Design a protein around this ligand. Structure first.
Ligand SMILES: Cc1cc2nc3c(=O)[nH]c(=O)nc-3n(C[C@H](O)[C@H](O)[C@H](O)COP(=O)(O)O)c2cc1C
Ligand SMILES: Cc1cc2nc3c(=O)[nH]c(=O)nc-3n(C[C@H](O)[C@H](O)[C@H](O)COP(=O)(O)O)c2cc1C
Lengths: 205, 204
C-alpha cells in the first residue's frame, strides 16, 4: 500500500495488471472494473462523463464495450478521439488514471464478445437507442417487447452496428496511492506519442 | 425507483434528497467522492481524477482543491467547462453534473481553508500539486521546511492557488439502475444558466 520507484515496472501495463489483479483478489473491492469514462466535444470543449466497466487490455490499449454510435459519448468521441478513464479503489486507497487517444475495436471482436452477453442483454442492445430521448418506461418496454418478439424466432441475436468495443491508447497513465498523511505517492508514465518511449516521474500530491 | 412523479422543479432538490439518502445510508461510506473531469480546450485532451464534493451554493456545485498549478487548473484555465459524477454503487445510483466552471469567492476559499486541520493547511503550502519532484525526500524536505516555516504562527495563511471552484450546471442527470438493465434515466437541461430547466427521459 505504498508505492516507490523500486516497484515501478518498465511497461506501465505491468503495474496496472498487478494492481488490478490485487483489486479483484480483494473482497473489499466488489467492482474493480468500474471506471469513469470521460470525454469531451472538441469544438465546444464541453465535458461529459459516465460510469462504465473496463473489459480488458489488448495489444494496444484499454478496452471498454458500449454503444459508440448514437450515445452522447459516441458523439464526443466522433468529434474528438481523446478520452480518459479512472479506476478508483476506495478501500485500497488507489486510483489509476489512463489518458490517451481512442480507437474503435475490431468489428470481429466487437461481435465475438457481443455473443457471450446474455440473451436478454443482446436484445436490450437493439431495443434501446442509448441516450436517445423517450416518452416513458412504456415506450421503452414496447420496444423491448417488440424486439423480444422480433428476435423470438432466432438462436443467436445479431450485433447492432452502434454497439461494440472502443480502446484507449494510453499517452498518460498515473498510479496514485493515498496515505492518511495526505502525502500520497504519485507516479505518472507518459509518451507524447504512441511511438515514444514511456517516461516515469513523481508528481506532488 | 425513479419516475416522473418523483421529479422536482429544481433539479437541485432531487440532488439533495438523493445525496442525503446516500449520507444516511451506511453502505455508502464516502458519498461526496466524485470524478472531476476536465479537458484542455485547444487540443481536446481529457483528464480526470477523484475529488470530494463540498457543497452547493447559490449558483452551483462546489469543490475545493488546487486550482492554480495543478493539471485540472491548466485545463480549466483554457476551458471553463467541467463534469462530475457521483456514483453510489450500492444504491445503484449515479448523478451527472455538467456545466461551466467558476472560481469561488476568495473569502469563502479562505474561510474553509481555515477549518482544515493544521497538518493540512501546511500541506497545501509544501505541495505544489501535480508538479514533478525527485522523490519522497524532496517532498518531506518541503513539508519539514514549511512545518518549520509556519511553526511560529497560530493560523496558517491560504495559498493563492488553493480555493474553491464551482460548476454552474447546464445538465444534471439522475440515473437509477435496475438489474433489468432498463435503468431509469432523467436529465435536466438549459442551454444557458438563464434558461428554464427541461426534464426528459433518456434511453438506458
Ligand atoms: C456500474 C455501471 C456500469 C455500466 N456499464 C455500462 C456498459 O457496459 N455499457 C453501457 O453502454 N453503459 C453502461 N452503464 C451506463 C452508463 O453509465 C450511462 O447509462 C451512460 O449514460 C451511457 O452513455 P452516455 O453518457 O453517452 O449517455 C453503466 C453504469 C453503471 C453505473
Ligand atoms: C478519495 C480521494 C479524494 C481526493 N480529494 C482531493 C481533494 O479534496 N483535493 C485535491 O486537490 N485532491 C484530491 N484528491 C487527489 C486528486 O484526485 C488527484 O491527486 C489529482 O491529480 C489532483 O489534481 P490534478 O489532476 O490536476 O493533478 C483525492 C483523491 C482521492 C482518491
Amino acid at each position: 500500500f505504498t508505492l516507490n520507484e523500486k516497484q515501478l515496472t518498465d511497461d506501465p501495463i505491468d503495474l496496472f495488471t498487478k494492481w488490478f489483479n490485487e483489486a479483484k483478489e480483494d473482497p473489499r473491492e466488489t467492482l474493480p472494473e468500474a471506471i469513469t469514462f470521460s470525454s469531451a466535444e472538441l469544438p465546444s470543449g464541453r465535458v461529459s462523463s459516465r460510469i462504465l466497466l473496463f473489459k480488458e487490455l489488448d495489444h494496444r490499449g484499454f478496452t471498454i464495450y458500449s454503444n459508440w454510435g448514437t450515445s452522447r459519448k459516441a458523439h464526443d468521441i466522433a468529434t474528438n478521439p481523446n478520452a480518459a478513464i479512472v479506476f478508483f479503489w476506495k478501500d485500497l486507497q488507489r486510483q489509476v488514471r489512463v489518458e490517451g487517444i481512442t480507437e474503435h475495436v475490431n468489428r470481429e471482436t466487437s461481435e465475438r464478445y457481443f455473443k457471450t452477453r446474455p440473451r436478454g442483454s443482446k436484445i436490450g442492445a437493439w431495443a434501446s437507442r442509448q441516450s436517445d430521448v423517450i416518452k416513458n418506461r412504456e415506450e421503452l418496454d414496447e420496444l423491448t417487447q417488440k424486439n423480444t418478439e422480433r428476435f423470438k424466432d432466432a438462436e443467436d441475436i445479431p450485433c447492432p452496428d452502434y454497439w461494440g468495443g472502443l480502446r484507449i491508447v494510453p499517452l498518460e497513465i498515473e498510479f496514485w496511492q493515498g496515505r492518511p498523511s495526505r502525502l500520497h505517492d504519485r507516479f505518472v508514465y507518459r509518451r507524447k506519442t504512441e511511438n515514444d518511449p514511456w517516461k516515469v516521474v513523481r508528481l506532488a500530491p
